[PDB]
Design a protein around this ligand. Structure first.
Ligand SMILES: [Mg+2]
Ligand SMILES: [Mg+2]
Ligand SMILES: [Mg+2]
Ligand SMILES: [Mg+2]
Ligand SMILES: [Mg+2]
Ligand SMILES: [Mg+2]
Ligand SMILES: [Mg+2]
Ligand SMILES: [Mg+2]
Ligand SMILES: [Mg+2]
Ligand SMILES: [Mg+2]
Ligand SMILES: [Mg+2]
Ligand SMILES: [Mg+2]
Ligand SMILES: [Mg+2]
Ligand SMILES: [Mg+2]
Ligand SMILES: [Mg+2]
Ligand SMILES: [Mg+2]
Ligand SMILES: [Mg+2]
Ligand SMILES: [Mg+2]
Ligand SMILES: [Mg+2]
Ligand SMILES: [Mg+2]
Ligand SMILES: [Mg+2]
Ligand SMILES: [Mg+2]
Ligand SMILES: [Mg+2]
Ligand SMILES: [Mg+2]
Ligand SMILES: [Mg+2]
Ligand SMILES: [Mg+2]
Ligand SMILES: [Mg+2]
Ligand SMILES: [Mg+2]
Ligand SMILES: [Mg+2]
Ligand SMILES: [Mg+2]
Ligand SMILES: [Mg+2]
Ligand SMILES: [Mg+2]
Ligand SMILES: [Mg+2]
Ligand SMILES: [Mg+2]
Ligand SMILES: [Mg+2]
Ligand SMILES: [Mg+2]
Ligand SMILES: [Mg+2]
Ligand SMILES: [Mg+2]
Ligand SMILES: [Mg+2]
Ligand SMILES: [Mg+2]
Ligand SMILES: [Mg+2]
Ligand SMILES: [Mg+2]
Ligand SMILES: [Mg+2]
Ligand SMILES: [Mg+2]
Lengths: 116, 87, 101, 70
RNA sequence: GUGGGAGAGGGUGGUGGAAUUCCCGGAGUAGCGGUGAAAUGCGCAGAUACCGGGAGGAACGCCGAUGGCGAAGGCAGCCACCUGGUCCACCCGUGACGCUGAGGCGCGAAAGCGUGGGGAGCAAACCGGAUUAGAUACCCGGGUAGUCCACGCCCUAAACGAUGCGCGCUAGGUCUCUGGGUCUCCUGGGGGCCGAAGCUAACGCGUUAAGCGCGCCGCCUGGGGAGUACGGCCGCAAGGC
């Protein structure tokens, strides 16, 4: 229903949860997945395993659209963001490249008390 | 700022003999120039306090030289006062 | 009058008439603000490091000038008024500090 | 891997318009390199910073870049 | 005086990028968020994640230091202007013009007050959620004053080096910032660490004295009662001395 076959895979991973989004080369989404997308509910969504399964889900749903190769963009520091990488590699999607994009402020905003 | 020619013309003006740079007359004069400028810059920039401390200090220095000069040679004092427009 | 360097970055998509017009209006700016010109280095198209006004590139001019003190700020203002001038940076001149010498 | 200063000619540390040189004081990311890497001195480094920043304003140099691999 | 410096010292104006929030558009479903685990909360009126565009406020990553400047409070993107202090070299000028300083006057973090603005994030009070003997509390979701700007008050603090200012004298070693020099190094000014003599109840201090001395100012005189009461002065008030 699209026929992309090469594109971008964003892995957004926080300590609480890991979410994956697969998109077309100009950035528009195709599919997505996350800890909650598969079974898990609570803290269980932050485990490396959930990341694995979410990466894998996203890749299955991608290879339905016809996705072959993908450039990876990683954002955040969280349990098994590297597991989402490792999963997303052996998924069968050939990975073109990997980049760590984690956004960082030049010190704009006061953070929450738990962050100081 | 106070450029070199500006400053020189003042030293020329107030020097006792040629070549005199550091006499009491010239110190007071130079000081006075600095003070005036500073006061102009504190007429606006009313919130620049640190500069103002600087002013208090210069003002004080001047008063010291004046008190001295007046102590030693009252004539030169009245002269300097009249010329500068102080007190 | 002190020594300054005026850096002007403007939009790369200009043709002849346009470029010459912005440039001549800049000339007029400096003439009006009492800024004598010494050196002029026009480097033109360069690929910027980050997009400026959604443009991937920029067109560069570098003037060296001597102009009065209080007039610099206002000069910069009347430079930036131009819609096609993307960035202006006016910088007090400095002697060439070297290194590894 | 030795210092940046170590391999370079005599170069204006004050020239914000020269990218071919200043680029070498930035990491993979946009970041200005620590003294340990730059091989500069206190005063030197201190000048290089200002110079770089001026350049970045002019868009000749990155405020930040994106890390490859990792 | 002349000639050189280094610097987040101060004031004014302008400008730059990252990020957060919100608004607009696309693409895209079933959740996101959050915790020890959870729930409140937000999501089918399409959220979260992703791309483009806009608006706004606040704060300046790397550089950055065990660094620098300031009398102190304190000062950190970049640019210009206005301005304070200070270090060095030359040995040029004046000729004791010095030190200190009760009172006075000025400055003085944060919070707080008044009148206007501004308001993104944070967040006293407050409203909710789970913990769980119990919630006024530590954890979670919201959230007002406030935080920001102008002007005018307030005058406190672990305002700390818990060490008043100035001058002279008394081993060195080492790291460092910043000048000068004939730049194995020496010489001057800062910042640190070890240590001579000495000091100290001890801990420690030791050319950045807590050593040896002189000058001047401030202050102390067992605990509790009490920084309370009374009085006075200041303040719009809080409250301060
Ligand atoms: Mg979770
Ligand atoms: Mg494969
Ligand atoms: Mg909140
Ligand atoms: Mg001088
Ligand atoms: Mg400053
Ligand atoms: Mg400023
Ligand atoms: Mg949308
Ligand atoms: Mg639900
Ligand atoms: Mg609901
Ligand atoms: Mg945006
Ligand atoms: Mg708004
Ligand atoms: Mg740091
Ligand atoms: Mg320090
Ligand atoms: Mg302090
Ligand atoms: Mg100055
Ligand atoms: Mg002599
Ligand atoms: Mg004589
Ligand atoms: Mg008394
Ligand atoms: Mg007093
Ligand atoms: Mg106050
Ligand atoms: Mg306040
Ligand atoms: Mg109140
Ligand atoms: Mg108020
Ligand atoms: Mg108000
Ligand atoms: Mg409870
Ligand atoms: Mg809260
Ligand atoms: Mg302290
Ligand atoms: Mg004493
Ligand atoms: Mg030492
Ligand atoms: Mg030295
Ligand atoms: Mg040297
Ligand atoms: Mg020393
Ligand atoms: Mg010791
Ligand atoms: Mg002993
Ligand atoms: Mg003793
Ligand atoms: Mg002993
Ligand atoms: Mg001992
Ligand atoms: Mg002493
Ligand atoms: Mg003692
Ligand atoms: Mg008693
Ligand atoms: Mg009290
Ligand atoms: Mg009373
Ligand atoms: Mg009254
Ligand atoms: Mg009280």
């Amino acid at each position: 229903k699209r026929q992309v076959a090469s594109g971008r895979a964003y892995i957004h991973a926080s300590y609480n949860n890991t979410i994956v989004t697969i998109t077309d080369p100009d950035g528009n989404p195709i599919t997505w997945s996350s800890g909650g997308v598969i079974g898990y509910k609570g803290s269980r969504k932050g485990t490396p395993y959930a990341a694995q399964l979410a990466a894998l889900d996203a890749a299955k749903k991608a290879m339905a659209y016809g996705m072959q190769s993908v450039d990876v963009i990683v954002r955040g520091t969280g349990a098994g963001r590297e597991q989402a990488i490792r999963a997303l590699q052996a998924s069968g999607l050939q990975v073109k490249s990997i980049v760590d994009d984690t956004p960082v402020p030049h010190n704009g905003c006061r953070p929450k008390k738990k962050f100081r | 700022p106070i450029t070199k020619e500006e400053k020189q013309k003042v030293i020329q003006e107030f020097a006792r003999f040629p070549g005199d740079t550091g006499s009491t007359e010239v110190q007071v004069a130079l000081l006075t120039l600095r003070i005036n400028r500073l006061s102009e810059h504190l007429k606006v920039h009313k919130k620049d306090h640190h500069s103002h401390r600087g002013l208090l200090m210069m003002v004080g220095q001047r008063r010291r030289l004046l008190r001295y000069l007046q102590r030693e040679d009252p004539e030169r004092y009245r002269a300097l006062i009249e010329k500068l427009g102080i007190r | 009058m002190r020594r300054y360097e005026v850096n002007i970055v403007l939009n790369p998509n200009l043709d002849q008439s346009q470029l010459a017009l912005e440039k001549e209006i800049i000339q007029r700016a400096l003439e009006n603000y009492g800024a004598r010109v010494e050196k002029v280095e026009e480097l033109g198209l360069r690929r910027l490091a980050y997009p400026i006004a959604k443009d991937p590139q920029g067109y560069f001019l570098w003037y060296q000038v001597e102009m009065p003190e209080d007039r610099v700020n206002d000069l910069a203002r009347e430079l930036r008024i131009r819609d096609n001038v993307r960035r202006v940076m006016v910088v007090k001149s400095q002697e060439p500090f070297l290194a590894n010498a | 891997k030795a210092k940046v200063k170590a391999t370079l000619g005599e170069f204006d540390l004050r020239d914000y318009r020269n990218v071919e040189v200043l680029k070498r004081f930035l990491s993979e990311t946009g970041k200005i390199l620590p003294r340990r890497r730059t091989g500069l001195s206190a005063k030197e480094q201190r000048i290089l910073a200002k110079t770089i920043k001026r350049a970045r304003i002019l868009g000749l140099l990155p405020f930040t870049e994106k890390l490859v691999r990792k």
